[PDB]
């Protein structure tokens, strides 16, 4: 750094001492210490650090009351299970599981994203949701752990609500096969919990991130992120999770996916191919 | 003129010369050193050069620096020999420049992680392979093209793609980067090649030795793709100052030599006049 | 009546309709011509079966269209906003009459 | 419409119209279907340059027509004059959109 | 007390790479573990033609 | 291929300077095939003599 003495500018050293962890601290640490640091400028200096490592409570809200429509398809996001401090975990692995009560009406599942360390509901079966017998289901959501086996549990009530309408005769299996707006919403793909596919409409500003397309969910599929739900089977959201080729003026995503496109963009995930054209 | 590959060829054809070469190599890598020196001052290995873009340049330089005894300047082991829109268009209408151009671009414009901007060593390898086997009327036209406004200067700055290769998270010490470049074989030889052809002069009218613009331009562009790889400082239309990615900070009492080492790139009238006269 | 082969043409980037905001010009190789004496017994029999409507009324092709064999690999350029782009498989390298 | 691939048929020899005088039946294969998942960046550039009329007004192809890749070897039969006849390359063996 | 071959996969038969396959048919036992083995060579022969557009999944629908 | 373009143009082998047209029959696969020759006594003769075999542009149909 440059310091002034008598209207001049001389330079001197500003040493920075920072304090760095060495391993993943577990939850069960409930300690505090004082650390002493010698500094030798070969003049002999001493430093101190009051460190306090406080443990973490892992309890959850007890009942997650929610619903699901009857028209939904397989692998459709419903709800989020998480600790009270979602975005606080950095180096502690927290996994989520389910335990069905009747053990006969298995319909849903939970996978955990390690970014937020949180689980997402997904429809696993269509027939069990289709039955009028398993209409109000009670699950024991058990929040587990990997390093130290402290865990907890909670209630999941879900209501099977609505009616069921068959899809059209020439429907494909993914939402992104459609190209115009009408054929997107008049047919149902795979990932949507609404049973129909959603259409987002972009702009005419050249190669943009705002590319007009047909997605299952306009908050999930063209998100720019390929989460744990979409990466299970590659028919759900091809425009966020593919490893393939793109025909048209565009720019691909940083690990994968379409980062920006031009015109309308559809995708054949059976051939790992995408097209972008107005 | 005998290069070091053929000097090793004539060295391996004899028994006394190979014995004294391996003797001095076991000495470096009293009386055993001095006798080998006074013998091998008459060797074909003595005063052997290398070539630019030759086959097995690395072995030639490893042989040449093997006989070298263990300092600001060193001897070069080589043979002492819109506008930028039009330069890119003249490249893309030829087939050899287009293929290697798209090669180094499609390598160096690949972001991997949100932290890692690009891969360093593959980008340097692609830039070296570009600037070795392309005819110099194409490289010098794209790297040195006269501009009048900011956008032309920005295209000229973005030509070696400094977003991957040139810039880093910090500007380290120039002397440390010089030590790193002089550790490696190739970078030290290219730096000595730049020092032998691009000093300033008080006798010649262009401040360049032998009044040779071509040797200084080839010694400049031969440093691309190493850790001491220079580029422009900004998008100035007329102000042309090249610099490596370092600074004078952290110098201690070695500040004057750091300033004098940096003035070779920042304040060289020889190199700037060569670039200006090539732009004319 | 000219043989089908390479034809070259210098074109703007923004005139290619790929939406890249740039004004550089690259060379473009395309396949052009007319295939006349390339009809085979396959071609004649398939044409006659179209004339007799034994077919199942689908999309068939009974004329040998002249297409590229292998394309060029990569063409890279820079835009109007200082950002490179790398287009794969832009022009052709070989023209064959299949 | 359907994707492009092999389709079988069984047709008479004299129904090929080639001048043969026989009534035996051969297994004629052909390539059929539609090309909608095979257009490339070359195709879009060629279509746009046809739109801007920069072309030299020749015969080009901006829709990839589905042709056979290879062909079958031989067809051997006999006719009304009791004479053997072998014809080369009557049907296809592999289909691809080119 | 005899075994019957059945096609388990279509795609592996569809590949032109796995055209001549060599299996070790091992004849085992339950009570006393005397066993034996033998060779199985199979050739993937013919061509492939797609089916029709409105086909069902079983033969007996027609 | 047609009759008019055969005689309104001159090939190589004819001493008349124009090409000759012989016209066949509709009796199936015959020796009497309609064609355009240099000479109707020399080119579709069924024999490849010493004159026609010098350079292969004269009489390709023999
Ligand atoms: C940590 O230790 C203190 C010691 O008194 C105790 O009071 C506290 O309850 C402990 N933390 C937890 C989460 O139990
Ligand atoms: C600091 O380092 C010097 C150099 O070894 C040593 O002599 C001196 O004792 C050190 N200071 C202390 C407090 O040990
Ligand atoms: C750190 O701990 C010591 C222990 O008593 C205490 O005296 C000191 O005030 C603490 N530091 C701060 C900043 O409170
Ligand atoms: C620390 O935790 C992170 C969290 O995912 C894990 O990826 C990493 O491997 C752990 N490292 C150690 C040394 O425990
Ligand atoms: C979904 O169902 C399948 C089949 O019933 C089962 O194998 C799988 O484990 C289920 N998913 C979860 C997360 O349990
Ligand atoms: Ca997504
Ligand atoms: Ca004859």
Author numbering:
A (entry chain E): 338 to 379, 387 to 622
B (entry chain C): 37 to 65, 75 to 115, 121 to 131, 159 to 357
C (entry chain A), D (entry chain B): 100 to 197
E (entry chain Y): 461 to 522
F (entry chain F): 523 to 584
Give passages from the manuscript.
Signaling through RET plays essential regulatory roles in the development of the nervous system and kidney. Glia cell line-derived growth factor (GDNF), Neurturin (NRTN), Artemin (ARTN) and Persephin are four ligands that induce dimerization of RET through assembling 2:2:2 ternary complexes with RET and the co-receptors GDNF receptor-α family proteins (GFRα1–4). Here, we report the cryo-EM structures of four extracellular 2:2:2 ligand/co-receptor/RET complexes, including GDF15/GFRAL/RET, GDNF/GFRα1/RET, NRTN/GFRα2/RET and ARTN/GFRα3/RET, at near-atomic resolution. The structures show that the extracellular region of RET adopts a ‘C-clamp’ shape, which is stabilized by extensive inter-domain interactions as well as binding of calcium ion at multiple sites.
Surprisingly, our cryo-EM results reveal that two 2:2:2 NRTN/GFRα2/RET complexes can dimerize to form a 4:4:4 complex through a novel ligand/receptor interface. With further 3D classification for the dataset of the NRTN/GFRα2/RET complex, we identified one class showing two 2:2:2 complexes arranged in a staggered fashion to form a 4:4:4 complex that resembles a four-bladed propeller. Subsequent 3D refinement yielded a map at 4.3 Å resolution, allowing us to build a complete model of the 4:4:4 complex by rigid-body fitting the atomic models of the protein components into cryo-EM map. The 4:4:4 NRTN/GFRα2/RET complex is mediated by a novel interface, formed between the protruding ‘elbow’ at the CLD4-CRD junction of RET and the convex face of NRTN near the GFRα2-binding site. Particularly, the loop connecting CLD4 and CRD (residues 507–513) in RET makes a number of interactions with the surface of the major β-sheet in NRTN. Several charged residues in NTRN, including Arg101, Arg106, Glu107, Arg128, and Arg155, contribute to the interaction. 3D classification result of this mutant complex clearly showed that the double mutations in NRTN exclusively abolished the formation of the 4:4:4 complex, but not the 2:2:2 complex, verifying that the novel NRTN/RET interface is responsible merely for the formation of the higher-order oligomer. We found that the 4:4:4 complex suppresses RET endocytosis. Our data suggest that the formation of the 4:4:4 NRTN/GFRα2/RET complex delays RET endocytosis, likely leading to more sustained signaling.
